[PDB]
Design a protein around this ligand. Structure first.
Ligand SMILES: NC(=O)C1=CN([C@@H]2O[C@H](COP(=O)(O)OP(=O)(O)OC[C@H]3O[C@@H](n4cnc5c(N)ncnc54)[C@H](OP(=O)(O)O)[C@@H]3O)[C@@H](O)[C@H]2O)C=CC1
Lengths: 499, 499, 499, 499
């Protein structure tokens, strides 16, 4: 008698004992007479083409795979609801926030960043925390991480950053020279790197970590007034981390530790939950903010910008088929219902394009008609047609052009976007040296105690150890810019690692 | 007031008059505020990425097209039912023939062969007549033509034949040298070419032609007893042809003559129907048959093997969305319910591989989950999993391996196929010199009268004249092998056409 | 003996006449022993799987087709050169214009707009005129039409317009009600529609029509100064059109009239050529221009902005394999070498995204690695890696991330784009009511003579007659906004055809 | 200084030291002026579509992934040559064996079977060992394992078997009951399962293991005489394994232990070499062989059928780009040059279909035109045309149909297959009850010593304990069917694991 996950097949048989097993059929529904023996000429003769039973199964096996996610490939999924606990209709007119008590079905995916489909869960890396809201004003995808910040603040460095985080193009091995050459040349990453190599770099499962929308977003109320915001969904189960000692053992003992823990939790009625908060910044407060309010490498301090609670996230359902419901999950930051809008955040702007595009590649042009991705709580009506694997009535014989005098769907003026005024030059602005150390200086000295600062440099030194000396001296110098003792600790550890 | 086809949008709006038009939404279900004006900076400024309304629409527009069919690309569709009128249960145990009165939902596609998506309907070519039967034991695709025979009798020559009937690989033009160089090198085409260039080469729409399964098929009844058979669909609307003169006029006046003719018919309640007949040959009679009974270039003469009535095919429903319902239609001759099986027809054996193969490319690995391709009157249960665009529960948490101790689907031993034993060396047997002339001589002398043979040579000479003299003399000689006068009539016209 | 098009294979054999025929192989290069006969057990036995010769040919045949172009599917191709004849280096620093006499290889594709792969060439429609310049600064794609203007001025209407021009989503028929309903609700189409329905709507082949960039572009010289421009590449063969009477005859007599004609021309040494002009507008003149200089439904009058000659485009080579060379051609308006840039033209803005997107769908992620699409006169080096069907060294073992301390490719600061200043509310500005008639009024009264206007109304009336009366009366008033006699001439024709 | 693998970028820079960095261009070859900062409106403004530098970079990143291999996903690659050292031309007429001393370029891929792209290398599993021979008669793909046998002997069980070895359809976890539920229901796997859980289940890298073709193949010499054969390709480095103790440790310390080991070896001049042997069975010996000579779960004993040496395979070159050269490597067992032919092995027959099929999905229809998949030592000439991503001239304007009178490729009668005679009922013959225990018994009793048997049982029990008890005792029952002492040593241990 084992954990509920391993008893998956066992329960399925029990859940069906009263029923008789179905007739085994071909993909076309034709009953198979025998599926253990190939159609051959004589007992030791060759196989026939006429064996259409064989081909139909064999061919589908051959196409079982789809391209994995280009980032965050290793993933865990769950389902539940979002429930409003406070009224913030003064900030957002989004129906998902309409009144206290309102529930919205959600879909959540947890993931790592660099690891592939088969990688270990208990490794040092950021963690994905994507949430899909099935609202009546369409689907809302809040694709956030377990950190309030990221390593870079311009989307043009994202493909580069990821490459450096993955495998060498010739050797196909993880190479720390790629890792630290990038990080040391781009000191803006100092903030997020400090987070990653801290205790929270290896969370104890998916239920013991916080989530952040990271990006500054725009909220718009009914009168047409707008504010900026941050999304924080903090763990109700409490922050708990794994030791570098306990994370490494698990890496071979249970590669899918996070997958198994989440599944076991929900299956056993122990439902994990998060409390959704926001921070709010007025357009006025945005212009006087000491840093760039849309810099993804920046946080909003809690003292100046307190958390305003909105609701609860509860995961109370395990997926039924992992592939069909979790691996085919597609999240689009461009999915924003009326009342929630993007800020001019350089990184967020890039994500508005990238995600729908990649889903059309990874899953298909009509990925939005896949059940788990469908906005099934909205009525989709538009002038979009066809595409590979078209799955519904394709909107019937409805007029497919707009405008028309034949009463096909109409635009909704209520859903017009907030109008902002901008001015300046149209060119590429250098953002590389906005203040990269001040908030990092704050994190190191004020948030961490002396013991965590000690482990922080150790985790850093242990990985920086593999880079060339010129990359090392560059990294240490970048760290010294945060705090001299911080920089001197890492290199002090390095002088011991270099024998 | 006009024909029903053109009034489609008019009728669509009338059908909705009580309702108010829907809110125009994105694929993610988010209402759009305006879909007539782009998000720009100032009235004459640049476009913004944060405008996801444009991208989501445009990106979908970009992927509207899927590969057209490699052959029979130009198509017309309709739906209806198959109804059993006579008892043929002594020959087949197939549920589709179970008792008199039995109805099966069907799907029919009509097509030409060589023309691409935009070509004219009224051209000389064979015609497709594919019928999809939605039976309880899965789908039955009886994929037939308007001819009992074909141009070739070996599956390895099919790509070649097709290439020769389509466009020249350099000029992208129809090439008479490609067409007849082939035909003259493969005299077996003499039978079907004679059919093609007769009156029935250009049918007056799809409602005035017969359809044939062409292939000899196998029928197996409840006792496991087997016979060979042919399928015949004779028009209840009567054979009716176009003169080449009026077919040519319609080619520019109405490129979609056959498509609209069908649509207008059904919409005005005038439902087209065909009468299903069979011919039956016992294992005893097959071996004493003068020719190869599985030779696709051979008919079974009515004198020896008369038609046995089975039922009626009735088309009484038009497609609602052509693309979702007719362009994504997939017929697999390999889709055969218990009671219907393949003969050793070299060509039919080849078709068992090709169609499922091409559909996985054209539509996708999971093309059978598309509504019109789905066997919705049967329960698909098997150990096939995953694949791109997985659309249902993916059969849940059911055990995905076979055999298993967990009550996942089981084979059904009753649905085993009839067992025949075969022998001779396993080798590549030459089929080039089976009787190519006897049945053709028969067709020329017995079935055609003096005026139709006269037009037959005129229709042939009119096309062969564009081929080189060495090809003409080669083709004519093949026609001379059929009948001296047949060869001599063609050469008489060619000498005038050659100036 | 026949035209060069018909003798393609004939010449192919003679051009090879000295050599022995090559060994017929599988895709894996294995020689075939027999490709006319299937491997079976006994002369009348079932086909074997062990026949991998059959499978390999058939499997490839099954995948011969790729998704056709969403628009401009019916096409003719040629290759040649662009030669600079005049000096415009004071306007553009682009290498393609560097000195007089300089030649650059080009590729040209001709197309209609609405017709599918099999549709007729000689129909009333705009004509595609895409030119790809293989410059040292990368490829330059000038994707223009045979008209200086278009039907719409916002990219959000393009999917709408196209749908209206193609087949009904239910009946799959061309629908005059769809066609004019769009046009009548959108009077901005009045300009281009006026072009389309008089003589130049049906050009006599591809060599007797002009080409236009239509869009306003930006030119930037060595001093960093910018101007706006229009591209006109006018035919050296002279404008020549087909009458409605016989253009219709060719639709059925020779569906590929332009396809054959273009091929025949080059092969017989008559190389077609076009003379490239530009028009130039300063930023200052853009500010005083009476209309929106980026309204695609507007021309720059020759009086105000005279043509400046640049060079010749000459097509002097026929393609060798149509598919590999013309069907796989991908033109990207986003392909612009340093010195040539986009204006804030809304329609042009949309094309920057749309074209690269669909090409990744239609052809593939690595579509730029296809020979005709490859920038073979430039050195492609970047941090792009992998993707489906990667065909080269994949840039070797070079570092794939940027920045790096390992001497991977570097930015070229000179190649930065022009800096413009923009400001205004970020909002969707209504352009629906920009002047729709003035330039149209000018075209009607000043450019056309009395019979061309008479023929113009006939062609419109001949097409509009099939639409509903409310659509007719709506359209006529739109035409009346151009000129009272114009609307009334059309209306005089409609009242008798409506019996 | 570090291992050669880690110094890849260091060395890349050195090889380039004289050179200055390339001009960074778009995929279309246009140089980019700045690729670190985005095109925006104002320093803190929104992103523009006009930034095509960004869009195309992101879009290509979005499409970097292709479906990983459905099996054998985790892989290592190397290149070298095959050298003939002995004469076996009396057995085979294949050009790869034509004379002593002859060298042929090879491509090798090493792999696990079940693990995905991110899985650990040092796990208990079979090892893939594929060799691609680039012969003048086309490519010869010898797709073998590190075992002479397999778990099953019929192709219809392969997809089922694989699923059981992979992840649970709901929980997405490795599931021990799935593994053994299958294995215990199919006792033929006892042989391969016995091999797997012995020392050689976890080899010390890829250079310390043997390769086997496993399948019986056919050899044909010039006289048309045929023999059956097994390929045994033995390591020159000697068998060397990792204990499970350090194999578990290496699993988290170095996920790509084998990948790095292979690369490091080749880079340091330490070239791995293996010796190719064959076993030969005459048609006469096949009829008297006590077991099925085509049973993939059976070996040919060395005593009756001694090893005949053929040549050497040597790997002396590392890949330059892993993706282009190793991840896109495609092996087809159906790729067989004249002189090598398939036996009637049920499993091998299935693989003729499966591999070409899956590659058309994974890589593309035209995957054989990929450099590493291309038969560059052969001339591909045939009548195959078009398809997505066509990369050469597509065989020019050559005639695309066969037969033809225009001197296109001709079949080569020399390349006909060996002709065999067969007889029997065409039916599905049951292979479940061929002798499943005898050859396993000798391995346990005669080949293993007393300590290896002890560990064999420990490793099984260590893994089998996780399955349900009803599954365990059934599996244990199979082990006792091999030998009573073998079964209960295992059973003594499971009962210890059952607390
Ligand atoms: N046996 C068959 O299935 C067919 C036979 N034939 C040809 O007729 C010869 C004799 O057949 P037999 O059965 O002995 O005598 P029949 O006269 O009974 O064969 C009559 C068949 O010829 C068909 N037919 C009549 N005119 C044409 C035409 N212009 N183009 C194509 N088909 C036409 C009829 O179609 P309908 O059924 O509408 O009268 C009928 O099916 C055969 O050798 C064969 O070549 C022709 C078609 C099929």
């Amino acid at each position: 008698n084992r954990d509920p996950a391993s008893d998956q097949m066992k329960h399925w048989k029990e859940q069906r004992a009263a029923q008789k097993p179905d007739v085994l059929t071909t993909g076309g529904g034709n009953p198979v007479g025998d599926k253990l023996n190939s159609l051959t000429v004589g007992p030791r003769g060759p196989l026939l083409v006429q064996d259409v039973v064989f081909t139909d199964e064999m061919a589908h096996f051959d196409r079982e795979r789809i391209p994995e996610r280009v980032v965050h490939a290793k993933g865990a999924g769950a389902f539940g609801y979002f429930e409003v606990t406070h009224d913030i209709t003064r900030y957002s007119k989004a129906k998902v926030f309409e009144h206290i008590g309102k529930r919205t079905p959600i879909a959540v995916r947890f993931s790592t960043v660099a690891g592939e489909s088969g990688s270990a869960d208990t490794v040092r890396d950021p963690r994905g925390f994507a949430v899909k809201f099935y609202t009546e004003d369409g689907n809302w995808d809040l694709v956030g991480n377990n950190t309030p910040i990221f390593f870079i603040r311009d989307a043009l460095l994202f493909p580069s950053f990821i490459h450096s985080q993955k495998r060498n193009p010739q050797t196909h091995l993880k190479d720390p020279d790629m890792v630290w050459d990038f990080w040391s040349l781009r000191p803006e990453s100092l903030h997020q790197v400090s987070f990653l190599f801290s205790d929270r770099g290896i969370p104890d499962g998916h239920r013991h970590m916080n989530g952040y929308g990271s990006h500054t977003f725009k909220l718009v109320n009914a009168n047409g007034e707008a504010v900026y915001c941050k999304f924080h969904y903090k763990t109700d189960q409490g922050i708990k981390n794994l030791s570098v000692e306990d994370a490494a053992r698990l890496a071979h003992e249970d590669p899918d530790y996070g997958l198994r823990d989440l599944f076991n939790a929900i299956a056993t009625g122990n439902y994990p939950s998060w409390t959704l908060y926001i921070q709010v910044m007025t357009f006025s407060e945005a212009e006087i903010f000491p840093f760039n309010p849309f810099d993804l490498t920046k946080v909003w301090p809690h003292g100046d910008y307190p958390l305003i609670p909105v609701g609860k996230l509860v995961l109370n359902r395990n997926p039924v088929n992992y592939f069909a419901e979790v691996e085919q999950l597609a999240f689009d930051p461009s999915n924003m219902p009326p009342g929630i809008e993007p800020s001019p955040d350089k990184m967020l702007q890039g994500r508005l394009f990238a995600y729908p595009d990649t889903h059309r590649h990874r899953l298909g042009p009509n990925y939005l008609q896949i059940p788990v991705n469908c906005p099934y709580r909205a009525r989709v009506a538009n002038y979009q047609r066809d595409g590979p694997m078209c799955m519904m009535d394709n909107q019937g014989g409805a007029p497919n052009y707009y405008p028309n005098s034949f009463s096909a769907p109409e635009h909704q003026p209520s859903a017009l976007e907030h109008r902002t005024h901008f001015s300046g030059d149209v060119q590429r602005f250098n953002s590389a040296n906005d203040d990269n150390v001040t908030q990092v200086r704050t994190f190191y000295l004020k948030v961490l105690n002396e013991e965590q600062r000690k482990r922080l440099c150790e985790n850093i030194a242990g990985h920086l150890k593999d880079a060339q000396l010129f990359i090392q001296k560059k990294a240490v110098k970048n760290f010294s810019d945060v705090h001299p003792e911080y920089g001197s600790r890492i290199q002090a550890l390095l002088d011991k690692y270099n024998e």
